[PDB]
Ligand SMILES: CCCCCCCCCCCCCCCCCC(=O)OC[C@H](COP(=O)([O-])OCC(O)COP(=O)([O-])OC[C@@H](COC(=O)CCCCCCCCCCCCCCCCC)OC(=O)CCCCCCCCCCCCCCCCC)OC(=O)CCCCCCCCCCCCCCCCC
Ligand SMILES: CCCCCCCCCCCCCCCCCC(=O)OC[C@H](COP(=O)([O-])OCC(O)COP(=O)([O-])OC[C@@H](COC(=O)CCCCCCCCCCCCCCCCC)OC(=O)CCCCCCCCCCCCCCCCC)OC(=O)CCCCCCCCCCCCCCCCC
Ligand SMILES: CCCCCCCCCCCCCCCCCC(=O)OC[C@H](COP(=O)([O-])OCC(O)COP(=O)([O-])OC[C@@H](COC(=O)CCCCCCCCCCCCCCCCC)OC(=O)CCCCCCCCCCCCCCCCC)OC(=O)CCCCCCCCCCCCCCCCC
Ligand SMILES: CCCCCCCCCCCCCCCCCC(=O)OC[C@H](COP(=O)([O-])OCC(O)COP(=O)([O-])OC[C@@H](COC(=O)CCCCCCCCCCCCCCCCC)OC(=O)CCCCCCCCCCCCCCCCC)OC(=O)CCCCCCCCCCCCCCCCC
Ligand SMILES: CCCCCCCCCCCCCCCCCC(=O)OC[C@H](COP(=O)([O-])OCC(O)COP(=O)([O-])OC[C@@H](COC(=O)CCCCCCCCCCCCCCCCC)OC(=O)CCCCCCCCCCCCCCCCC)OC(=O)CCCCCCCCCCCCCCCCC
Ligand SMILES: CCCCCCCCCCCCCCCCCC(=O)OC[C@H](COP(=O)([O-])OCC[N+](C)(C)C)OC(=O)CCCCCCCCCCCCCCCCC
């Protein structure tokens with residue numbers, strides 16, 4: 026359960042054997058969420074609502090950087 | 103030179119264009135006074151220059167700032183007071 | 191009396207400093223807290239260096255092959271020659287200018303073919 | 304001599320061999336949790352303990 | 353301009369210290385022989401490292417060659433800004449003594465033959481003529497270590513450098529220079545040094 | 555030792571440490587425009603050069619002349635010889651330009667959040 | 682031409698007195714007839730074989746001085762090698778030694794420039810290799826000074842490049858072979874110093890090593 | 894002279910971690926309900942946890958606390974307050990402190 030962009034980033038990242046070390050790259054691996062969309066008026070209203078809801082749901086999750094269940098890492102790599 | 107002509111008041115001269123296009127890219131740096139960091143840098147440089155002038159004031163014809171005078175302190179302290187870049 | 195008190199203070203300070211500076215070598219402290227702290231510091235340093243290296247690797251992979259050589263030159267310089275006085279940046283600039291000469295030749299060929 | 308280090312080792316041995324701290328007699332749990340849950344530490348941490 | 357500010361403050365401090373030194377000399381015993389006996393003191397050594405330069409009269413004749421060399425070494429080793437200030441001051445020397453070497457072709461070729469026989473220059477430079485490598489090495493030595501030509505013979509210095517370089521290994525080697533006092537250098541040094549390699553002697 | 559102190563003062567004021575440009579700047583700063591010998595006599599500098607609130611034409615002409623002269627000098631020097639150690643200021647400027655190019659590449663191919671996290675971690679490690 | 686060169690080669694290999702005399706005579710007669718390449722080749726062969734009359738070597742010096750401008754890098758190197766392994770009683774006039782010295786220095790400078798331009802880390806790597814095992818007083822040396830002129834040299838002040846010289850050299854073998862220990866390095870340095878002293882009695886390598 | 898560790902002081906710590914793992918293996922050798930493969934490719938936190946329980950049994954088991962004698966410089970009445978104070982300061986900076 027991953028995508029080609031994340032696979033490319035992971036394969037470029039080499040010589041890492043520790044989950045904490047990989048988590049140090051969590052921000053870089055977050056680029057896999059391309060979420061490519063056009064900037065039409067409807068898509069812009071969507072993007073706004075979706076990103077606000079994502080911020081709210083992340084606040085409710087309140088997970089730390091150590092536990093990132095939705096960011097694929099060492100096991101899938 | 104003839105500063106008298108410049109001093110002379112004129113309707114057209116007063117209502118003409120004084121600042122041209124070329125001056126804007128050469129003088130836009132004056133807007134950095136808005137930043138507290140830049141204001142502090144300038145104040146530090148001015149205070150250092152004043153200290154140097156005071157130390158070298160022993161030579162004739164050079165007088166440093168006197169802390170007793172109110173005008174000097176007020177002008178040195180309120181130079182950036184109430185600075186607003188939005189109002190012309 | 192006063193001298194003895196001063197020396198007692200000095201001895202306590204020196205023991206504290208020696209502990210704070212070299213407690214990671216021995217196991218006097220249960221659980222080896224200073225040793226684990228030093229190991230963590232080294233791990234963080236190595237992870238930061240390897241993170242820089244991996245960022246360079248991914249940028250290299252994503253970079254076009256035309257300017258891959260320029261990226262290699264810039265990366266090697268930023269890693270090694272920035273802190274070295276004997277490395278003259280003029281030579282690096284000359285290499286960049288040779289690459290730019292090739293690029294300009296290709297550009298003009300495309301324009302006036 | 305009653306040396307400090309040797310006495311510390313001997314008292315640690317006495318405390319651990321008294322049998323009052325036998326792991327068989329304890330059901331380790333988080334404690335701070337609202338509900339009774341077993342120890343949630345990692346496998347390596349359990350082996351270290 | 354930061355260098356100028358540092359130099360000016362150091363000059364003010366030096367003048368004040370010299371005034372204090374003259375006052376102390378005129379007040380106390382006032383004997384240079386007595387003063388010279390304290391050159392090994394901890395605080396006197398610190399003061400010398402702080403305000404001693406070969407182009408100034410402070411302790412002009414009160415220090416020997418060994419003491420001056422030790423003071424210079426300490427300053428160069430554990431005092432960055434003082435080293436900067438004193439290196440700027442050293443520009444006043446204006447020595448600019450440039451001396452050529454190897455006037456006689458016979459002697460130059462004999463030295464080249466000795467170096468070629470006793471050392472392999474292919475290790476230092478790859479895919480190049482031996483004579484060209486020898487000339488390049490001479491040019492490098494002249495550029496870098498010519499400072500010692502005032503006291504050390506060029507041929508002797510070159511032989512010493514070659515022997516020290518080849519003592520490590522008679523093969524291509526890689527050398528990394530680190531200043532652990534700096535954060536970046538320290539991190540790189542600890543990351544690059546491995547205990548297994550040291551044990552294996554690699 | 556008074557003569558030694560005087561010699562030390564002269565050396566510390568020597569050109570190689572206290573630039574004559576610094577001395578000239580200090581003199582201009584301390585003196586007014588009517589007492590400064592370099593500009594009090596000269597009406598052109600005091601009026602035409604520094605007396606105009608806007609002298610764009612003269613500034614542009616001076617800049618063009620200076621640029622042409624400096625380009626000619628640099629080209630001649632590069633054509634003649636290049637194995638000469640350059641000034642620390644110019645060397646640092648070139649180093650900064652190269653580092654800026656590399657940083658631009660890194661920013662282009664990296665995320666702002668990742669950059670910020672890496673910089674924060676590096677600063678914490680430095681502390 | 683080719684036959685004469687082959688004859689010279691064969692006679693030099695044979696290393697007979699009469700053959701050397703005949704060679705010397707023929708080459709002396711045909712110096713003008715032979716081109717620059719043949720002259721350089723025969724000079725190199727005579728140098729390597731360690732033979733040749735003083736008059737022949739003097740005339741070869743004159744010819745080399747005359748035809749020096751039309752020499753390539755290989756020709757210059759061969760001439761240098763021959764005049765290096767020339768007979769002892771060959772005190773040369775004060776123009777060929779100057780020409781050879783200038784040519785060698787120019788070749789070294791050009792090679793240094795080309796190598797540095799190809800790889801900016803060439804000089805840094807060489808200096809690091811030299812200073813790895815060097816002494817503390819050697820490392821203490823100052824830094825290079827900027828010789829460039831202009832405002833910073835006339836009206837301004839240019840800060841020196843000198844900085845703190847407390848550095849640690851980590852040496853690792855590229856191939857991976859075991860490196861020499863401290864005692865082994867000391868023995869190697871001592872042996873090289875002894876050989877250099879034997880070659881030149883006046884060398885102070887002993888004092889240099891004893892310093893640190 | 895500093896709180897940071899040198900290169901020679903990290904191989905020792907790596908050997909400490911390896912020795913802790915090997916000590917655990919040796920002690921629990923005769924235990925069926927033990928899988929040692931988990932010790933392969935440990936994380937940094939796991940290595941720190943093992944180093945926490947690391948122990949060295951070749952060290953002396955007695956207390957190493959002891960008393961060292963540092964001879965003093967008896968006060969010299971022939972000098973004076975300031976001269977004696979400076980002598981004491983230089984002694985502290987040169988011999989007593991190091
Ligand atoms: C003068 C008045 C100024 C004040 C009023 C300003 C307007 C009101 C305020 C609006 C505020 C909210 C924003 C609303 C619009 C949002 C549009 C949007 O996000 O669309 C996504 C659209 C798609 O982007 P994407 O999916 O990320 O990638 C596109 C790729 O290029 C891939 O594309 P491709 O290569 O496959 O080719 C297709 C591409 C091809 O696009 C091109 O680049 C081709 C260019 C062709 C010529 C462009 C000019 C003709 C159209 C002008 C706009 C209509 C009139 C505006 C003036 C109204 C008043 C008189 O077209 C598209 O992808 C779709 C474009 C359609 C969206 C824009 C049309 C509406 C813009 C005007 C505002 C809408 C409300 C108007 C209300 C009044 C009138 C009803 O994004 C853009 O392209 C944005 C471009 C920049 C827009 C700037 C704002 C509009 C400026 C119009 C010109 C006005 C004169 C200049 C001076 C203005 C004052 C400084
Ligand atoms: C600056 C200019 C303006 C803004 C421009 C646009 C934004 C630019 C910056 C951001 C660009 C990136 C945008 C996001 C890209 C996607 C990132 C991503 O991957 O995040 C997704 C994230 C992945 O993270 P993870 O894998 O969970 O790892 C957690 C780690 O902690 C790792 O966590 P993480 O690092 O991945 O954190 C993700 C976080 C990264 O983004 C951020 O951290 C946000 C950065 C920008 C905002 C920073 C704000 C800082 C505030 C404090 C500073 C002072 C503020 C003062 C303000 C004064 C004035 C008010 O994503 C967001 O929250 C994106 C929000 C973007 C919109 C920002 C604007 C929000 C405005 C809200 C206004 C307030 C509310 C409305 C008004 C209320 C009052 C009337 O989550 C998901 O994939 C969600 C999946 C969907 C299902 C979730 C279900 C949750 C519930 C079940 C949980 C249990 C699961 C099952 C059990 C366990 C497993 C078996
Ligand atoms: C080697 C080089 C060679 C070069 C050679 C060639 C050279 C050529 C010539 C070049 C010449 C160049 C000369 C010029 C260069 C220097 C120019 C200069 O001075 O500029 C520096 C300039 C100087 O600052 P300043 O104006 O003097 O500061 C005023 C004082 O702070 C006074 O402030 P205040 O006290 O009156 O009230 C504000 C209050 C702080 O009170 C507040 O909290 C104010 C909150 C305001 C509203 C924030 C709303 C946030 C929500 C989004 C925006 C909503 C829309 C409305 C926004 C309105 C505007 C804020 O400030 C404090 O008291 C803070 C304590 C001061 C010490 C700490 C300093 C921290 C950094 C400063 C910013 C801190 C912001 C904190 C925000 C809150 C965090 C919890 O610095 C800045 O512009 C700020 C720092 C940089 C910010 C970068 C942001 C990048 C974008 C980030 C996007 C993602 C995050 C977005 C959300 C925010 C984070 C959660
Ligand atoms: C504080 C005391 C003030 C006393 C005032 C008394 C009145 C007389 C003043 C005399 C000095 C000025 C006139 C003579 C200058 C002669 C220069 C010369 O020929 O030297 C060759 C000298 C050769 O360099 P070097 O020694 O080899 O060192 C190599 C370094 O790379 C070169 O750098 P460095 O490490 O040597 O240090 C200089 C460095 C800076 O050093 C300093 O800070 C200087 C500190 C003060 C030094 C004061 C020295 C003079 C003291 C005179 C008074 C003595 C009094 C003694 C009596 C007793 C007093 C109690 O300057 C720069 O290179 C700055 C360039 C970048 C612009 C920075 C400013 C804007 C901010 C840009 C931020 C961009 C960030 C990124 C983007 C952010 C976006 C948001 O050339 C230069 O340094 C070129 C500098 C070009 C830029 C200068 C103008 C920009 C501002 C400079 C810093 C601020 C001070 C400005 C003057 C303030 C006057 C009140
Ligand atoms: C509330 C205010 C705001 C600030 C906060 C409050 C701060 C409170 C600070 C309190 C400090 C308490 C210090 C207690 C020390 C007790 C020492 C001790 O054990 O006593 C026995 C000791 C017995 O002497 P001894 O060791 O047996 O030696 C006698 C032998 O027969 C002779 O043996 P010898 O001949 O073999 O060799 C020694 C001889 C060898 O000759 C020397 O080395 C003599 C050197 C004379 C000075 C040379 C420089 C002249 C230029 C002026 C000073 C500029 C500063 C640079 C000083 C460089 C180092 C001297 O020198 C002597 O005779 C040694 C005694 C020298 C006393 C004469 C000088 C006194 C004034 C010093 C300067 C004070 C600061 C002035 C700042 C500027 C004011 C405008 O008592 C004395 O003889 C001296 C007692 C001195 C008591 C000083 C109390 C000062 C209280 C007021 C402080 C504020 C002053 C104004 C500044 C305000 C700034 C805000
Ligand atoms: C004086 C001027 C003050 C101006 C202050 C304006 C502040 C506005 C703050 C809005 C916050 C909205 C938060 C909800 C989420 C929004 C969408 C989002 O997350 O962005 C990323 C989204 C997603 O883009 P993306 O998909 O490319 O994201 C890239 C990141 N990855 C790769 C991970 C996907 O960006 C957009 O869709 C475009 C954003 C910019 C749109 C600009 C529209 C015009 C704005 C005009 C000015 C502001 C309005 C008028 C103000 C008047 C004041 C008087």
Ligand SMILES: CCCCCCCCCCCCCCCC(=O)OC[C@H](COP(=O)(O)O)OC(=O)CCCCCCCCCCCCCCC
Pocket residue numbers: 125128129603604606607608609610612613614615616617619
């Ligand atoms: C043919 C040559 C004639 C002149 C020869 C001697 C000139 C020596 C002095 C140099 C000129 C100083 C002019 C000062 C008055 C002035 O400019 O006056 C015009 C305005 C005055 O500013 P204010 O209105 O804020 O007082 O200047 C500016 O806005 C700043 C411009 C720069 C001035 C200093 C010079 C900088 C270096 C110039 C080259 C860089 C690019 C410049 C823009 C194209």
Ligand SMILES: [K+]
Pocket residue numbers: 211212894895896897898899
């Ligand atoms: K330590």
